[PDB]
Hints:
The chain has 855 residues and is of the alpha/beta class. It contains 30 helices and 18 strands. The chain has a six-stranded parallel sheet. α5 (197-209) packs across α6 (225-239), α6 (225-239) packs across α7 and α25 packs antiparallel against α26 (725-733). It is an enzyme of class 3 (hydrolase).
Amino acid sequence: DFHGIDIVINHRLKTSKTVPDLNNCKENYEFLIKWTDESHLHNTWETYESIGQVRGLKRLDNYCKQFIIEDQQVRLDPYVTAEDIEIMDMERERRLDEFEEFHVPERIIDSQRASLEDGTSQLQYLVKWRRLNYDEATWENATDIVKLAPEQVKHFQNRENSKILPQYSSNYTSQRPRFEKLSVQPPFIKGGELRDFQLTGINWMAFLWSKGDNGILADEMGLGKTVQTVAFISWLIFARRQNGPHIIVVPLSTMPAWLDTFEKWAPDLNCICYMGNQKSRDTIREYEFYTNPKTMKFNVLLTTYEYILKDRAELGSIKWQFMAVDEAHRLKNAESSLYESLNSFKVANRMLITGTPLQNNIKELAALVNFLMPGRFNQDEEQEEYIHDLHRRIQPFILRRLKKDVEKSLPSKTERILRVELSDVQTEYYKNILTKNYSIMNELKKASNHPYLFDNAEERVLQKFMTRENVLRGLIMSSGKMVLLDQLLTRLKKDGHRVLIFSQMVRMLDILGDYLSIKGINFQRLDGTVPSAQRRISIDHFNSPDSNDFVFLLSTRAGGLGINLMTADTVVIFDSDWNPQADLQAMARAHRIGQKNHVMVYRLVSKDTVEEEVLERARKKMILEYDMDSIGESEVRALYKAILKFGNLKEILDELIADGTLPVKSFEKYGETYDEMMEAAKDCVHEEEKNRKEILEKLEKHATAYRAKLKSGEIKAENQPKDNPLTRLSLKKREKKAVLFNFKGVKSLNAESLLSRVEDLKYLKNLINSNYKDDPLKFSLGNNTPKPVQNWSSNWTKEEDEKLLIGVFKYGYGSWTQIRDDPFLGITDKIFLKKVPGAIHLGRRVDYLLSFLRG
DNA sequence: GTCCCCCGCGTTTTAACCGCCAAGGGGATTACTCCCTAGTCTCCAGGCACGTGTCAGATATATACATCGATTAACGATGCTGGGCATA
DNA sequence: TATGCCCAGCATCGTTAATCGATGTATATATCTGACACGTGCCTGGAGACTAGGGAGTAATCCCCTTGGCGGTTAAAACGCGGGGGACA
Ligand SMILES: Nc1ncnc2c1ncn2[C@@H]1O[C@H](COP(=O)(O)OP(=O)(O)O)[C@@H](O)[C@H]1O
Ligand code: BEF
């Protein structure tokens, strides 16, 4: 709640030497300081004497110290070169790129109208910013959000209008509907077009979904397995009416990719994922349900694997029906916490999208069999029968679509091995370790390709004297993979290719980080240490067509974790990571469909070592490649309110039923009840006129009979008789009754408001649609000025009359709960419940505006 | 910085120590026999692992009843305000 | 023509009644997990039964060791006095 210093944004000078001290930073430089408990849009250039003693001051002292050292490294040092200027100056634009992303929103979480100190109540939005966790979500008023990013406000209103709550979802658990194998594509792909095997896979998932069974999508990496999942979920929600919540577990590295693809292909569905640790959990819990002792405002989310094990009570207390997972190789063993954790969620159908090798161990395939079908089910001689029965037994429940059907638009594939010999350092480090001197088992396998893995190893090679070229010279010649890697790297640099290096050891990545940095090679690492905010900037920087990073380092599990590289084509592997097909899936992050200049792969096989035996063992595990017509009282009243709000409901009834008011009935019954209500209304008005005119005639006869006795002189003039036909006739002219009729128990139903409501709403639909159909925010009236206000505590002009009809045109009459919360009108502090703007007091004003426009 | 409880030291008072002799309880040795143990067999039922089963608590869950919160349609009485009718 | 007089006209205030929805409270039912008792099956580590032998019981004798009593010197414990130096605040 305190207004202290959070972080530092930018820095410059305030008043327009060898080393500026802190005093020069006080009386000579101003710094852009970001305050805590506040958005990044309130950054002010402050120093020390302008704010005084405030909470938090050491951060700016350390930042100013790094700025002093930076100034000592820009032009106040005789040892600086040329690349150091581009690096130190590159950090400036780097921090600017990491700070400008906090000013643009990305999502509006909630929208609660809070009161101020002057008594007014303004609607503030829970703004979510870009490249930031769910924390630090500040409330911003609706007076400047619509003036900066209207797409987030319009989409935020679209999430509330498109009511896809689970209470509207169908319940085909007792009987599945008739399924039809489609061939075309549904009009929901707004991103791009699809081929044939995508729609075939969708027809397979929906083909098996109608039978109450689950399958495994085992296609090739790159055939659009993510798009088929989003299209299958969207088609299942909007087709089979399955708007219920669907949990899709996605790793944290691929979560932003699935968010961008999900919003790019299906923008009509929200994608509120689950990230953070503590406060973000409170954000997801406060956004999950309402503060009451069951308001489902979500459906599709993304949960990381660790977030499942960390939070089992929050996710386990919610019902689910569909489960999707990318890279489902984590379920290799049936004795893990994730395997028993996913089986605890009461779901209905599952779907496994992965390509794990189900041939090296039977517990993997069997684990994937009993994972979705609990109950279903060695020697080399009986293996032909075991796979002869299990093969065709599992074929109807698996998709095996090879890449041979998509090679018509893909470049050729090739791979060349390279048996690299050892050197003298690898000989002494390969023989002298298992003797006497040390200076257990896996350390030899790790040191079978690079000696620099301990401590007493760099000073042993350096037999002379700080130098720089001698260290790198003694570093490249220590192993053959460095000399051959530098020669092949130079050969690829003579033409122009994007080369990748996949390594298992995390220390070798740092060794390459110290070797490639001296040679002037711009690159960026990617392992399991940096957070998503950094690796996402690195990958988004590598995907640029003008990127100068021709080398991009990865890892094994982190390298083949997810996402993809489109501009990469060359994949260099130091050694096999002790896993079959791990190299195929590792090259799958670069060798993809978007690549056009082919793919060249070099495997640095260590000759006469220990990795060739592991490679042979990996080849051994690779050769195996085998009531509807019933309308109750609440339906008559709710339908009557639907007529009072929307009028004619024979054209947008599908939108007036899915809102949650009208139950699931037949449209013909709504049409018949509507025709009977309107017909009985018109007939009741006609009878009301035929009888009312007769009553008026009787009051004219009795009134004349009273006047005949009044003009004679039989009535005293001292007291005027109030009980005469004249008074009851005058009160009959100003009668306080309406055309009422009881329809099927429901009493107090007016017929004039229905006809006049259809006329007013019809004149509004034809008036707005007959002039501005695709731009309702540009409708005008001209010179038609109605009567002024009657003592109102707010300014009201013609613009309020023009924008006031927009809310009635969109939401309808009587829906003042959405008009006061609409930021596209400007009447935020002009609609209340003591006060002048009332509910019916303004509605009758709208009726006066419509009656004024009709005349 | 103060006060009084220990050490050092001379003399007064008790009992430890050494020498001698006595007497008998109790420990040390021995011989014989007889109960109690290790050793050896057979047997299982005691015990170990595990599937199967209804009952403590705990968690909702469809259904019904009672009590408001708040909203909207309806009714009693106008207040200037607008649109026309008899007089300066 | 301007100024008081007749006839509507919506919004001002207040009050009644029907309705959707939230809150509180039962009430019999369908899961959830955690079992402790039983029967399933099997091992044999105990029980059961018998033998054989040598330890330990006891009894009968021995003689060493422990307790006792006594009296003479001769050091030791006991006492006090006095004042210094360590405890304690
Ligand atoms: N239907 C499609 N049409 C065109 N391109 C597609 C389609 N589906 C996927 N892609 C391409 O595939 C890339 C995404 O890869 P993706 O299939 O999501 O990886 P994964 O193997 O994790 O599913 C995108 O860059 C996109 O260009
Ligand atoms: F093969 Be995908 F990129 F997971």
